[PDB]
Amino acid sequence: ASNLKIVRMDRTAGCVTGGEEIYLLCDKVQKDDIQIRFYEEEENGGVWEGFGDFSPTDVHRQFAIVFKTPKYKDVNITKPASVFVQLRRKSDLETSEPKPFLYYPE
């Protein structure tokens, strides 16, 4: 929808160890009721999830968030791991349409 929406991200891939800064342009969000969720449906095993590292201060005028990537689940991957990133409102867990994110082996 447009409520929560990732307009564009400056990085769509990142080192498996996480900790990398990303500029994410989004539709209006509340700095204190927003988290960036990286996740991967582990199919039969469920769903892995990691959250972008940032504070309300990194939410620029409610239309962008500069954050750092979470460490992927398996920091010893041999080849790229495809996950998803979605904006998610903390209160009611509302979600944006996901964006593909590639985690690459260090």
Binding site for a second copy (CB under 8 A): 7-8, 10, 21, 23, 25, 27-28, 60-61, 63-64, 66
Please report how close the Cβ of residue 21 comes to a second copy at its closest, in angstroms: 7
Between 34 and 39, CB nearer to a second copy = 34
Complex with a second copy: residue 61 or 79, whichever CB lies closer = 61
- Our CB check for a second copy shows the closer of 64 and 81 to be 64
What are the Cα distances from residue 102, in Å, to 3, 31, 82, 99?
25, 26, 5, 10
**Which amino acid belongs to residue 53?**
D
Beta-carbon contacts of residue 61 (< 8 Å; ≥ 6 apart): none
Nearest-approach distance from CB 64 to a second copy, in angstroms: 5
Token pair for 91:
């209160």
